[PDB]
Amino acid sequence: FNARRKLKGAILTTMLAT
Amino acid sequence: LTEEQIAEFKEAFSLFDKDGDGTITTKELGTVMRSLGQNPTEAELQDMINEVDADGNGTIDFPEFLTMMAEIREAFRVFDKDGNGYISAAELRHVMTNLGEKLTDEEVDEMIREADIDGDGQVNYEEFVQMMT
Ligand SMILES: [Ca+2]
Ligand SMILES: [Ca+2]
Ligand SMILES: [Ca+2]
Ligand SMILES: [Ca+2]
C-alpha cells in the first residue's frame, strides 16, 4: 500500500473530473 | 516524467477505468464526473476524448492518458464535505468509497499522515496544495 500514491491519484481524478 | 508520477497517473487512470479493460470510454468519464457532482454533455465528453486520442480509436488507453497528463480549491471542496476547511479521515474515507475504492481505516489514516504537515491529524487547504505542488 502506497499512501501518497493512492491519495494523489484520487486527488488527480477529482481535479480532472472538476 | 518521474517514476512516482507515472504511478500516480496510473492510479488516476484506474479510477476512471470502471470496467478495468485498459480503456476509458466516454461513458466512464461521464459516470465518474457525475459521481463527483459534475454534469458533462455528450459533446463535451466527446471533445475530451477527441483532444487526447492519438490513434483515433475513440477511447483513451494508459499511454494516451500519460501524454495528456504530461482547480485545487475546487478539488479541495469535493473532499471537505462539511466545508470547515479541514479534511478528516471520515471525509477522506467517504470520497474514496465514492470512487469505488474499498480501503481500511488504517490506510485512510496513513493517507492523512502523508499530507498532514503540522501534525494536527487533518489536512487543511495549504497542506492539500503543497501535496499537489
Ligand atoms: Ca474501460
Ligand atoms: Ca485511443
Ligand atoms: Ca471537513
Ligand atoms: Ca494538518
If DSSP codes are grouped into helix, strand and coil, which group holds residue A1? coil
Asked whether residue B62 falls in the same domain as residue B120, the answer is no
d(CA B78, CA A14): 8
Cβ partners under 8 Å of residue B4, min gap 6: A4, A5
**Segments forming the whole domain that contains residue B51:** 1-75
d(CA B36, CA B2): 28
Query: Nearest CA to CA, how far is B64 from chain A (Å)?
Result: 15
What CATH number has the domain bearing residue B84?
1.10.238.10
- Give residue B8's Cα distance to chain centre: 10
d(CA A9, CA B9): 6
CB count in 10 Å sphere of residue B10:
14
**Residue where a domain terminates, one of B58, B75, B92:** B75
1-18 of A, contacting B, C-beta below 8 A: 1-18
Cβ partners under 8 Å of residue A5, min gap 6: B4, B7, B8, B11
Give the resolution value in Å: 2.0
* Interface check B43 vs A, CB under 8 A: no
Contact A7, B72 (CB under 8 A): no
For residue A3, give the DSSP letter: H
For residue A2, give the DSSP letter: -
Query: Sign of dihedral through CA atoms B26, B30, B33, B38?
Result: positive
Cβ partners under 8 Å of residue B25, min gap 6: B49, B58, B59
Asked whether residue B67 falls in the same domain as residue B81, the answer is no
Asked whether residue B90 falls in the same domain as residue B55, the answer is no
Asked whether residue B93 falls in the same domain as residue B50, the answer is no
Written as nine digits, the cell of B16 is 476512471
Tally of structural domains, chain B? 2
Asked whether residue B42 falls in the same domain as residue B94, the answer is no
Nearest C-alpha in A relative to B3:
A5
Nearest C-alpha in B relative to A15:
B75
Task: Give the number of whichever ligand sits closest to the CA of residue B91.
Answer: 3
* Interface check B3 vs A, CB under 8 A: no
Q: What residues of chain A lie within 8 A of the CB of B110, using their CB?
A: 1, 3
Contact B72, B132 (CB under 8 A): yes
Asked whether residue B22 falls in the same domain as residue B69, the answer is yes
Asked whether residue B71 falls in the same domain as residue B84, the answer is no
Asked whether residue B5 falls in the same domain as residue B50, the answer is yes
